[PDB]
């Protein structure tokens, strides 16, 4: 375990594959950093997974690296207002205001962190067939 002060005098690696030097030219995938400023790096730590830097509401966003920061913030703020199944004993509880979805469905593009958030078991949404088009101008 390391805190904010101990992280100042340590060298952490993003992925374990970066611990060893490789030997590409793919116009579809991302480009890894060159890191040609230092001759030889002496890594002392290694991150378990980068996707763990996010929180609870941010882990639900599918592929957050392909979005914008304001959009991600808006999604993380709106995720706390989605209708779904908050608890399994809603029939015996007398809350002031409760909203329960009819047919809760799990998303197709899920993340591994959801496996620890009980999202695939208690979802808050539906997989609807969406089309991107300009019909009779009633969707502008």
């Amino acid at each position: 375990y390391v805190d904010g002060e101990e992280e100042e005098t340590i060298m952490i690696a993003m992925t374990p594959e970066d611990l060893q030097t490789r030997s590409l030219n793919d116009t579809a995938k991302r480009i890894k950093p060159e890191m040609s400023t230092s001759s030889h790096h002496t890594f002392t730590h290694c991150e378990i997974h980068p996707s763990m830097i996010l929180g609870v509401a941010a882990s639900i966003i599918p592929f957050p690296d392909h979005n914008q920061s304001p959009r991600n913030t808006y999604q993380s703020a709106m995720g706390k207002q989605a209708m779904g199944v908050f608890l399994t004993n809603y029939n015996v509880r007398m809350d002031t205001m409760a909203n329960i979805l009819y047919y809760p469905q799990k998303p197709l593009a899920k993340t591994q962190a959801m496996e620890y958030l009980k999202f695939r078991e208690l979802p808050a949404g539906q997989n609807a067939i969406v089309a991107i088009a300009c019909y009779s101008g009633y969707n502008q």
Partner: protein
């Protein structure tokens, strides 16, 4: 939450510092007056007992 209140200017305690890596969520934050102050811990965060 940071007990600073809505009183103040600039953005010293509201901006996302570089030391917030792997400790708090860099995206989950309220909008309006509580933007930058109220934060949420990461998925692998821990508090000392």
């Amino acid at each position: 939450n940071t007990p600073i209140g809505r009183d103040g200017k600039l953005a010293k305690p509201r901006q996302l510092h570089n030391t917030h890596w792997g400790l708090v969520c860099p995206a989950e934050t309220p909008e309006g007056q509580a933007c930058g102050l109220v934060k949420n811990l990461s998925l692998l965060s821990g508090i000392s007992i």
